[PDB]
């Protein structure tokens, strides 16, 4: 288990760690989060009590360094930093635990939710989507746009997701126009899987990271990406069987974890109805269809 200490909490803020969250009052004696499970990426996120505008946060893996949070009163936010003095870091952390100023990552032992939401997500790939190579962690916020959204403006502050465009020369082979538009298997299997992502795990890793940015930050471009990557699969007649089985498990836990009240803005009616009831894979997502029909039958 690992720890992300906080220098202090000068402004009232709701803090999230993965799918948990808690309120910290202005100048409360809060010195961070302990007992964080090793072996998974994590995200630590913030929404100020005053300006609920801009949710923002940091993807990190404790195996990659000692990280802490410190408020910056000039830039006005909680910043993640790395401590290079390993000795200094354990001394700090131990003192805050003895004084019990830290919240404990509150994992129930039956609960595989976070694993299931991040199974294929890897820090190395996050850092390629969020470009800032001098830090081992990655900042995301609500307003960051995606490379495809910019083609349609600050390139240093973008989400470099894989561009998927169904009416593109990359997606459509000359002479196969009808075949390739109506059945996206060439685009999925040859262009994306073999060509770009190399394997289904990297594909699923981007899909899950896109979902998580949409849910935790309300990042619209991430939502667009998550739905695109589902639709590409759902609209391909020929998909490896293990991929469909895993996709059903991925989506199940995503729909399970979604806040009931945010479904109206995070779920694309057309994509879901298409995927579940019209597409080639309409009968292949049994777990996902069951949870969608029992939780969001209005959407369908």
């Amino acid at each position: 288990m690992n720890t992300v200490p906080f220098t202090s909490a000068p402004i009232e803020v709701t803090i999230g760690i993965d799918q948990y969250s808690f309120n910290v009052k202005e100048n409360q004696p809060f010195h961070g989060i302990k007992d964080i499970p090793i072996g998974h990426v994590h995200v630590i996120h913030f929404q100020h009590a005053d300006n609920s505008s801009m949710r923002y946060g940091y993807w990190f893996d404790c195996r990659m360094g000692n990280f802490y949070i410190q408020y910056d009163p000039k830039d006005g936010l909680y910043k993640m930093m790395e401590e290079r003095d390993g000795a200094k870091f354990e001394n700090i952390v131990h003192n805050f635990k003895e004084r019990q100023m830290m919240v404990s990552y509150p994992k129930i032992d039956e609960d595989d939710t976070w694993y299931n939401l991040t199974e294929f997500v890897q820090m190395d790939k996050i850092r390629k989507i969020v470009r800032k190579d001098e830090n081992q962690f990655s900042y995301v916020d609500s307003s960051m746009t995606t490379v495809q959204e910019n083609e349609l403006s600050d390139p240093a502050h973008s989400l470099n997701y894989t561009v998927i465009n169904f009416k593109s020369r990359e997606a459509i082979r000359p002479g196969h126009e009808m075949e390739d538009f109506l059945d996206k298997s060439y685009y999925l299997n040859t262009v994306m899987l073999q060509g770009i992502f190399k394997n289904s795990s990297n594909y699923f890793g981007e899909l899950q990271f896109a979902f998580l940015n949409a849910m935790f930050f309300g990042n619209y471009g991430s939502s667009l990406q998550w739905h695109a990557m589902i639709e590409l699969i759902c609209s391909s007649a020929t998909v490896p069987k293990h991929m469909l089985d895993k996709l059903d498990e991925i989506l199940y836990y995503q729909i399970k974890t979604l806040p009931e009240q945010y479904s109206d803005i995070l779920l694309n009616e057309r994509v879901w109805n298409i995927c579940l009831y019209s597409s080639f894979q309409k009968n292949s997502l049994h777990n996902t269809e069951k949870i969608m029909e029992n939780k969001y039958p209005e959407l369908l």
Partner: protein
């Protein structure tokens, strides 16, 4: 975006554009089989591609052989239309390629867009106009060449005859759509109106009769009567 009554005069500016109508591409007769089931038999079709400023009509005949052994023919027909339009554009010198293609049915937008990815600068647009181009097969010389074809074939026609010598494209298109609207509403009455006077002939190189200016006024008025008429006989007014 879409073409409608507000931006109607854009059809007669000097940007090259083409209407595409796919209504008559996939045509069938429905009939009973010996066992008393129903079956279709395809007949020849055509793509209706028209430049509204000049009257140049590229009539691409769709021979029934193109359907042989194919499934989901109504869907295929939209893609086949798009493939043939795309081939046509590719065959034209650059300075003759259209800047916009306007499709009369919204179901052609995606098929045409995909077949024209090579031409990102050609705008594919729908229209809110309810154009009567489906009635093109009520023009005897067009129907004849379509039905006579034994293979795929592109026939070239000027759908305005020589009208542009005497009237503007805006007026020529208005006349054309009035005629086709009338043919669409009551083909018999419409054709009676056009041919009643045997001294006004259709020239061998024309589609419509050689009416004088005065006679076109009379004709145009009679087609308006027809369309109002059938609008009562249909809505009891």
């Amino acid at each position: 975006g879409a073409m409608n009554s507000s931006n109607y005069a854009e059809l007669f500016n000097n940007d090259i554009k083409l209407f595409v109508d796919d209504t008559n591409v996939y045509r069938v007769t429905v009939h009973k089989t010996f066992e008393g089931n129903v079956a279709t038999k395809a007949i020849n079709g055509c793509i209706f591609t028209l430049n509204p400023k000049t009257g140049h009509l590229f009539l691409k005949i769709i021979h029934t052989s193109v359907w042989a052994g194919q499934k989901r023919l109504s869907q295929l027909a939209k893609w086949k239309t798009a493939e043939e339009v795309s081939a046509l554009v590719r065959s034209l010198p650059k300075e003759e390629q259209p800047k916009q293609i306007i499709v009369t049915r919204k179901a052609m937008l995606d098929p045409l867009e995909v077949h024209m990815l090579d031409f990102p600068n050609i705008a594919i647009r729908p229209t809110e106009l309810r154009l009567p181009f489906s009635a093109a097969m009520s023009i005897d010389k067009l129907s004849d060449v379509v039905m006579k074809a034994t293979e795929p074939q592109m026939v070239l026609f000027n759908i305005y005859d020589d009208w542009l010598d005497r009237i503007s494209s805006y007026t020529a298109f208005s006349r054309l759509t009035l005629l086709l609207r009338a043919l669409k509403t009551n083909e018999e009455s419409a054709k009676m109106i056009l041919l009643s006077d045997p001294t006004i002939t259709i020239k061998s190189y024309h589609l419509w009769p050689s009416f004088t200016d005065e006679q076109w006024i009379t004709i145009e008025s009679q087609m308006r009567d027809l369309i109002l008429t059938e609008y009562g006989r249909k809505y009891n007014v």
